[PDB]
Design an enzyme around this catalytic site. Structure first.
Site, mmCIF file in Angstrom:
data_model
loop_
_atom_site.group_PDB
_atom_site.id
_atom_site.type_symbol
_atom_site.label_atom_id
_atom_site.label_comp_id
_atom_site.label_asym_id
_atom_site.label_seq_id
_atom_site.Cartn_x
_atom_site.Cartn_y
_atom_site.Cartn_z
ATOM 1 C CE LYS E 154 -2.898 1.268 3.189
ATOM 2 N NZ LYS E 154 -2.182 2.668 3.935
ATOM 3 C CD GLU E 180 -0.339 7.261 10.051
ATOM 4 O OE1 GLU E 180 -2.006 7.326 9.948
ATOM 5 O OE2 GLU E 180 0.662 6.689 8.884
ATOM 6 N NE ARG E 181 -2.097 0.589 14.237
ATOM 7 C CZ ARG E 181 -2.572 -0.136 13.531
ATOM 8 N NH1 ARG E 181 -2.491 0.382 12.021
ATOM 9 N NH2 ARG E 181 -4.477 -0.901 13.041
#
Ligand code: ATP
Ligand code: ADP
Ligand code: MG
Ligand code: MG
Lengths: 187, 503, 470, 35, 456, 105, 128
Positions: E154, E180-181
């Site tokens: 991705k 977001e991580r």
């Protein structure tokens, strides 16, 4: 600290503020002075100019607090009612003011020993019979009690009289007797 | 109408005390105290009740403070005096806590005296940003073959142990804690891992059995146990994971490596939901508050691998989650699966089919992956993972496989052999080189001729063999981290000769 | 003491206003002017000098302004030897019509749980004589057991069988708490105990105390009766050091009772209608039922599973509070097998080869594995029929059906239901029987010989008699 | 989901139970006469 | 205008003003804090009190603490100086590289373009990727649902789209890491640095990053998509570019909006989503469109809760999606990169009236032969082996080497124009290369490279 | 004059609580000081709930709400043919105003 | 009255689901907060304090009895609903009736697999 409960009880915002004022005045045993002062501030705020100015939500709260301080100091009010109105204007419960007064009033109404009395009749009663009625109804009460009588008239009872003394209730209307006879004949 | 419109306060104001650093309990119920005054208190600040109980100011409202009580309601009555402490909640940290069992506030509950630590740390600090971190690159060894081979964990990762009740989650955590003894005893200081076990909402008997098990394995000298058990106040069960996280961040900030096990986060979410529902905060799905995801995410983002400019330390997190009938689409399982870097999934059918640990390899995933492995485990586990994936593809054809082509039958056979190879006994973690030797024997084909019911036995005997008479090759594989060609030939010779002389 | 007035009555919730001396939370209050005793337990301080309370009895006939007296302590019940052979209710009054319970000491039903340093790590098997329990999920001396099951699966029969076996094989002042269950069952248990010498009406040497709050009680009584029984057992454990048995039927009702007042206590509902405080209430009640270093409490709790869910918040929250959970399945009760224990859903913390031995552990694990394989093979049977399996698959199915039958056992307390006589099978007899059925030593005997027997000798004898008649 | 066909109690679980009972009652009659 | 905090409940803060009540959506600055705390007005409660949602933690807040009205919504720096930098929801740098020295700041709350600013006919956005441009083309000013997560490349596809839109169209990109991580945000930052898309030394950076972290309050996660959209809106409306905007993830944008609405006491709708779900999604997505100056094309990573496509969050997101790119692991484990599933990727502009008759017929032939090959593989005739051969060659020719991978693999990256893709697949379908081997099409650009690889 | 005009007490959730408008009808169009319009939905003893046809960002507490005296209506007629209008009948195609002589509820 | 005078009575509650509905209406109009399916929190108490009054007395109290046959209507066979599970947990057994059994000719449509009598053979004649 322990709070002194009034002889009668009222609830809601008005009842709570009235219980507070009653306790704070019975501590300094100044009940009648604050009674008359609450009637004075009620007559003051009921005047339409103030009732329109200080009941306005799109003007600042502090401005109306200052105007209430003005109107309570200018009319020679006790510190009790003074900071009571200041508290009402601070919490924003000015609209409940009259209510508080009303609550306080009825408290004093039972502190003086005034019991409501309704005497419903089919026609306007006779004055000497009304005096005898007041005399005999005096006997339904303890010491330090006074009938506040309001002999409203309802011609649908066809005769007799319906008496309510506080919460006690005698139903001597003839319509009640005829309805009992009807229920007895049908059952 | 109004919390601070009580007749006592109003009567006192009509009559005409410090309401800045001091307050009075307007009401108390179910662990929530509505307190009048305290006009200088901060959000999430600790306060003291007159009976000695502590509380935390969670709701700052215009006329009252909502304080959650760290104890029992009976010791707080209306009109009690509440004082400020002027500080946000903080716990003691340091190496003085290694070997101790503390509560959610860092108070010793083992009777061995007061924690002689010198440093304190706020429980609600923010996680490291983007730049202070580096990529998760070094293995966190659990000692379990299935985890170390197919679901590898790195130092700095957050791997979720998720499954139904009584599936083996605490056993995986405790095996991982016991495994680190070989690294903490040795001299290599970059392989040492200090462990923290946070127990939320468990029995005190369960935590006592766990501490005994960790003491028998001599794993307590490098372990901190934080226990907010089931009879503790919901605030304490809410706060215990953050206390443990601060204790581990002390190590993460000083170039050391810590592992933390939240067992489990379901019970912490339940305690937080109770605290929120009693504070009249708007409930959401399953009555959970709107910021329960925020709760678990700001808890779990604090596990990080630091770059070399910040000490190079790390904090690895192993949160535990109990699902109800395998429902991973429930609210809190969904949140925690979304937050973490993968999940070790445990099943009940796998458990009772003889597969212990009951790790479902199809549903388990590690997003860090092979970056969290050694070159030897890479070599063997790539092949093992491919072969087990093919076996899972063709497994439905079993119980009829005898009537299928040779390719399907060989896939089925190799898969059954490898599946029997991943079984393991409790409280016995293996070194990475012995795991590599066993997986080498399994995937290179030296078990196809063997019967399934015998595989385990082989894997046991062989192991003892290679531990006694082949410590040199084990030392070589462990020191070089990879199977060299000489080491590959030596492994091949060892396994073929053992199998030739095996019963 | 302090005197207040009733200001509100809604259902089983009573708001009482005090002038001087607000009582602390959890105190008991006596409603004055009642012919029977009405106790109100304080739950919340509402402000305005008012407390909210839960009534331990019915609230009919209560008037606003009725006077209430503060006891100055939580509900205090008589504790001691003199409670043995008696039946008391939630507030400690005798309900067996045998006069006052004259003890030298009263104990409050609300107490703190034992500390962490008071725990004991000793685990030792308690042999019950039931094959499935002894084999697949053995109980521990001084551990918490728990019996899960829906309506009509056998929780009451199983707990009465355990009462019989253990509490007669015991000499340590058992205690039974009836929490929100049927009154007919309480009368039945009382007369069973009087008949079997466990309760002694004359010559007072009884060895069981009875506490009963049944279905007709308001939610407060059903929420505190478990704590009353717990308090009796706690006295026996701590104030005497004795090893105690505690049988609670049914503990779910405790939780349920809380729910029935939650909305009236002003609390936003949680999931499935439960109180927000379900887990912490269950925890403060369950963490007191435990073995300390001071003494032992072996706890057997029946746990009702609403609609056979087991994911419902109450059983799911109870699961983590036990040491050996026995799960009764309706699907197994429909097979005629009794007890209806689920072999693939019951778990013990001492099912460890370093505690029970390698032979017992291996036999249990082999039984569970063959039953799981049977479950897997039933689908292929459904699609293909039984006449298409490899002979080893048919052998697996046959041995699994035999193990299923042999897991069933006739109970002494079920002679009226079954007709058969009761059996009490030792541990090694169970292990040997299942080891032999697993090894294949009875592939020639029919599966119906193992059903409703004791040890394997009875299975062989029944097979012989079947062959003779059939 | 092992054993879920019989566990659903549908038209396929009833026929599975019927098949097992038929087969094993035949086998029990065959095993009792040889005893 | 200065006000003071009157209530702090979690991430909700009630602030009372004495003059000049701030409008809704204005940003307020809490005073006397070590770090910048920004509140956003949500309601006017009456009595000069507003309710606000916090953009950061509210610990340590005191009732009475002063709060300044900024006078506008959250304003973020917009310009070419944001390219290659990382900023959070309120526009401050979170990469420790210094301040972002743009000349102008834009408010993150803006109305969508008017009716007379819309483009009246859809055009194609050529990405240079063969499978995308052919089978499921992207529309300018459209939304693309990117399905598939880890292990299917991705990030490689994202960076290649950035590079290809920068080269072919000259349009920059914005990446909004909603929810977001932090570990994966650091990972993405460093993969963008290594692949040259971000350059820390000169001004040749192609993408601007906006990170709303997973450990931030739900307000920050609900507004980070608007921050990224504001950067992209600058690049479109002031430089007439065809901007790319990535939203990873969009389900997390919905989730943050739901959490914010639950915090404000609003009654949840169906499945627990905010009652304003459709209008929140709409007010965000309608700003992603083609105006008369430029356009913004949005690639949005879709997560589907419980694999339920009728769930309110996907069902509301799918109403705005103009295309779909499905990254499959069954294609990656087959050897094809990018791992786009050519039979599950869809497009709304795959219509003969939009892409023309030739494009439509080539794409339909490719899809039909791929479905035929799946059918034939199910049963493993006369010409069906020829269909198998042509379809395997089509599968190989769907692959492509990317430039952002040249450092790791050595193979040069290919940006295939649209005409070359159309004609190459047309020729493979006609049979012009039925003699060339199967692996002469694997990992090549145009078909001329396939014949040049077949020569060898 | 709190009979034809009111002041916004609260705004949010798409609803504006207005103080005044004593002579406003139920379902009547009101005009906010910012140029937006609304519909009187809830006539209450002490306020009017107004459904705002537009964004609540444009309406503040204390804003003036005048009443138009007309129940919510739109322009109708032949003059709308060929036009693109919004839900209130305002042309959004830039071709100038709608020259309608008739309105309809 | 009969139970307390040495006589035996039988009562049928047809049905208790509608009593639960009426109690829910009264409680919701009394502004008591709703629970599951809007039913009040104490609907179980509603039915248990009613069904506990069916009892067999001993000789000292007359020897009378009161048998109770409550009726419960389920929706689409959902025995797992709130009020059905309440009343099932209260009573001494159930007689399950089915629509499939009814239309297959089995009348009365009693499901002998599910229908249980917790008293059982203890309350039968020896011949039966
Ligand atoms: N690898 C193993 N081999 C054999 N037995 C095991 C293994 N792992 C766990 N067990 C056993 O399975 C049982 C349950 O495991 P465990 O309690 O650790 O998991 P859990 O999910 O945390 O349970 P709980 O639901 O109580 O929290 C334990 O008795 C344990 O001894
Ligand atoms: N061990 C058993 N043997 C035979 N029948 C049993 C056994 N256990 C239960 N039953 C049957 O199931 C019925 C339910 O009994 P009970 O113990 O009251 O279940 P529960 O308490 O779980 O509702 C019994 O009346 C009996 O008919
Ligand atoms: Mg556990
Ligand atoms: Mg029972």
């Amino acid at each position: 600290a322990k709070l002194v409960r009034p002889p009668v009880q009222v609830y809601g915002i008005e009842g709570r503020y009235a219980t507070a004022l009653y306790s704070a005045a019975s501590k300094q045993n100044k009940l009648e002075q604050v009674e008359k002062e609450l009637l004075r501030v009620a007559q003051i705020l009921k005047e339409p100019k103030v009732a329109a100015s200080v009941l306005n939500p799109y003007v600042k709260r502090s401005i109306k607090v200052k105007s209430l301080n003005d109107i309570t100091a200018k009319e020679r009010f006790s510190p009790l009612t003074t900071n009571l109105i200041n508290l009402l204007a601070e919490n924003g419960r000015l609209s409940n003011t009259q209510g508080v007064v009303s609550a306080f009033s009825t408290m004093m109404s039972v502190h003086r020993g005034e019991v409501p009395c309704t005497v419903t009749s089919a026609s306007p009663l006779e004055e000497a019979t009304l005096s005898e009625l007041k005399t005999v109804l005096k006997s339904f009460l303890s010491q330090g009690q006074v009938l506040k009588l309001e002999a409203k008239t309802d011609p649908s009872i066809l005769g007799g009289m319906i008496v309510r003394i506080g919460e006690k209730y005698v139903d001597m209307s003839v319509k009640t007797k005829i309805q009992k006879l009807g229920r007895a004949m049908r059952e | 109408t109004g919390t601070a419109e009580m007749s006592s306060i109003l009567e006192e104001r009509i009559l005409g005390v410090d309401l800045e650093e001091t307050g009075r309990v307007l009401s108390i119920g179910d662990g929530i105290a509505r307190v009048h005054g305290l006009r200088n208190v901060q959000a999430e600040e600790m306060v003291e009740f007159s009976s000695g109980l502590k509380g935390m100011s969670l709701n700052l409202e215009p006329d009252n403070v909502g304080v959650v009580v760290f104890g029992n309601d009976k010791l707080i009555k209306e009109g009690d005096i509440v004082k400020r402490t002027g500080a946000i909640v903080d716990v003691p940290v340091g190496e003085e806590l290694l070997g101790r069992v503390v509560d959610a506030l860092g108070n010793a509950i083992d009777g061995k005296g007061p924690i002689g630590s010198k440093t304190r740390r706020r429980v609600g600090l923010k996680a490291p940003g983007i730049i202070p971190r580096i990529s998760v690159r070094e293995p966190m060894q659990t000692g379990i073959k299935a985890v170390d081979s197919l679901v590898p964990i790195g130092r700095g990762q957050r791997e979720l142990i998720i499954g139904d009740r009584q599936t083996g989650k605490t056993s995986i955590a405790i095996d991982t804690i016991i495994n680190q003894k070989r690294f903490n005893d040795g001299s290599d200081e970059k392989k040492k891992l200090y462990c923290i076990y946070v127990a939320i909402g468990q029995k005190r008997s369960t935590v006592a059995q766990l501490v005994k098990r960790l003491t028998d394995a001599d794993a307590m000298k490098y372990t901190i146990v934080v226990s907010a058990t089931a009879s503790d106040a919901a605030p304490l069960q809410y706060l215990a994971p953050y206390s443990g996280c601060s204790m581990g961040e002390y190590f993460r900030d000083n170039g050391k490596h810590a592992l933390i096990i939240y067992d489990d986060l379901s019970k912490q979410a339940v305690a937080y939901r109770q605290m929120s529902l009693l504070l009249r905060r708007p409930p959401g799905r399953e009555a959970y508050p709107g910021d329960v995801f925020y709760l678990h995410s700001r808890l779990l983002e604090r596990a990080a691998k630091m770059n070399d400019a910040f000490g190079g330390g790390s904090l690895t997190a192993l949160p535990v989650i109990e699902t109800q009938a395998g429902d991973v689409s429930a609210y809190i399982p969904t949140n925690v699966i979304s937050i973490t870097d993968g999940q070790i999934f445990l099943e009940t059918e796998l458990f009772y089919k003889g597969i212990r640990p009951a790790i479902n390899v199809g549903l388990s995933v590690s997003r860090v992956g092979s970056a969290a492995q050694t070159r030897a485990m890479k070599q063997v586990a790539g092949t093992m993972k491919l072969e087990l994936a093919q076996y899972r593809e063709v497994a439905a054809f079993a119980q009829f496989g005898s009537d299928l082509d040779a390719a399907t039958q060989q896939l089925l056979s190799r898969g059954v052999r490898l599946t029997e190879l991943l079984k393991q006994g409790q409280y016995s973690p293996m070194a990475i080189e012995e795991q590599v030797a066993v997986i080498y024997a399994g995937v290179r084909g030296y078990l196809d001729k063997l019967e399934p019911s015998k595989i385990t036995k082989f894997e046991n005997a062989f192991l003892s063999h290679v531990v006694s008479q082949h410590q040199a090759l084990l030392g070589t594989i462990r020191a070089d981290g990879k199977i060299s060609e000489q080491s590959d030939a030596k492994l091949k010779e060892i396994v073929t000769n053992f199998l030739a002389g095996f019963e | 003491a302090a005197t207040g007035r009733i200001v509100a009555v809604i259902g089983a919730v009573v708001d009482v206003q005090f002038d001087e001396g607000l009582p602390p939370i959890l105190n008991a209050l006596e409603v004055q002017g009642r012919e029977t005793r009405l106790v109100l337990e304080v739950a919340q301080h509402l402000g305005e000098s008012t407390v909210r309370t839960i009534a331990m009895d019915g609230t009919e006939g209560l008037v606003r302004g009725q006077k209430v007296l503060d006891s100055g302590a939580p509900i205090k019940i008589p504790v001691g030897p003199e409670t043995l052979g008696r039946i008391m209710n939630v507030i400690g009054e005798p309900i067996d019509e045998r006069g006052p319970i004259k003890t030298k000491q009263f104990a409050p039903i609300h107490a703190e749980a034992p500390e962490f340093m008071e725990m004991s790590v000793e685990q030792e098997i308690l042999v019950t004589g039931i094959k499935v329990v002894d084999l697949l999920a053995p109980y521990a001396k001084g551990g918490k057991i728990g019996l899960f099951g829906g309506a009509g699966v056998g929780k009451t029969v199983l707990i009465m069988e355990l009462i019989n076996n253990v509490a007669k094989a015991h000499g340590g002042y058992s205690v039974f708490a009836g929490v929100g269950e049927r009154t007919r069952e309480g009368n039945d248990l009382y007369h069973e105990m009087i008949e079997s010498g466990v309760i002694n009406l004359k010559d007072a040497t009884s060895k069981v105390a009875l506490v009963y709050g049944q279905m007709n009680e308001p939610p407060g009584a059903r929420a505190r009766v478990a704590l009353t029984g717990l308090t009796v057992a706690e006295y026996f454990r701590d104030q005497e050091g004795q090893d105690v048995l505690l049988f609670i039927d049914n503990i779910f009702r405790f939780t349920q009772a809380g729910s029935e007042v939650s909305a009236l206590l002003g609390r936003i509902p949680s999931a499935v209608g439960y109180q927000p405080t379900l887990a912490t209430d269950m925890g403060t009640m369950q963490e007191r039922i435990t073995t300390t270093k001071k003494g032992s409490i072996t706890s057997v709790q029946a746990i009702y599973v609403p609609a056979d869910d087991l994911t419902d918040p109450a059983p799911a929250t109870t699961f983590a509070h036990l040491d050996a959970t026995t799960v009764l399945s309706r699907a197994i009760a429909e097979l005629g097998i009794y007890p209806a224990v689920d072999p693939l859903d019951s778990t013990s913390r001492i099912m460890d080869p370093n505690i029970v031995g390698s032979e017992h552990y291996d036999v249990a694990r082999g039984v569970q594995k063959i039953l799981q394989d049977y479950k897997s093979l039933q689908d292929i049977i459904a699609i293909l029929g039984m006449d298409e399996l490899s002979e080893e698959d048919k052998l697996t199915v046959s041995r699994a059906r035999k193990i299923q039958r042999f897991l069933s056992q006739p109970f002494q307390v079920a002679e009226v239901f079954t007709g058969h006589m009761g059996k009490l099978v030792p541990l090694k007899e169970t292990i040997k029987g299942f080891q032999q059925i697993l090894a294949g030593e009875y592939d020639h005997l029919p599966e119906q010989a193992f059903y409703m027997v004791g040890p394997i000798e009875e299975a062989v004898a029944k097979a012989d008699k079947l062959a003779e008649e059939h | 989901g092992a054993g879920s066909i019989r566990e659903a109690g549908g038209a396929f679980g009833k026929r599975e139970q019927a098949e097992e009972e038929r087969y094993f009652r035949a086998q029990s009659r065959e095993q009792l006469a040889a005893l």
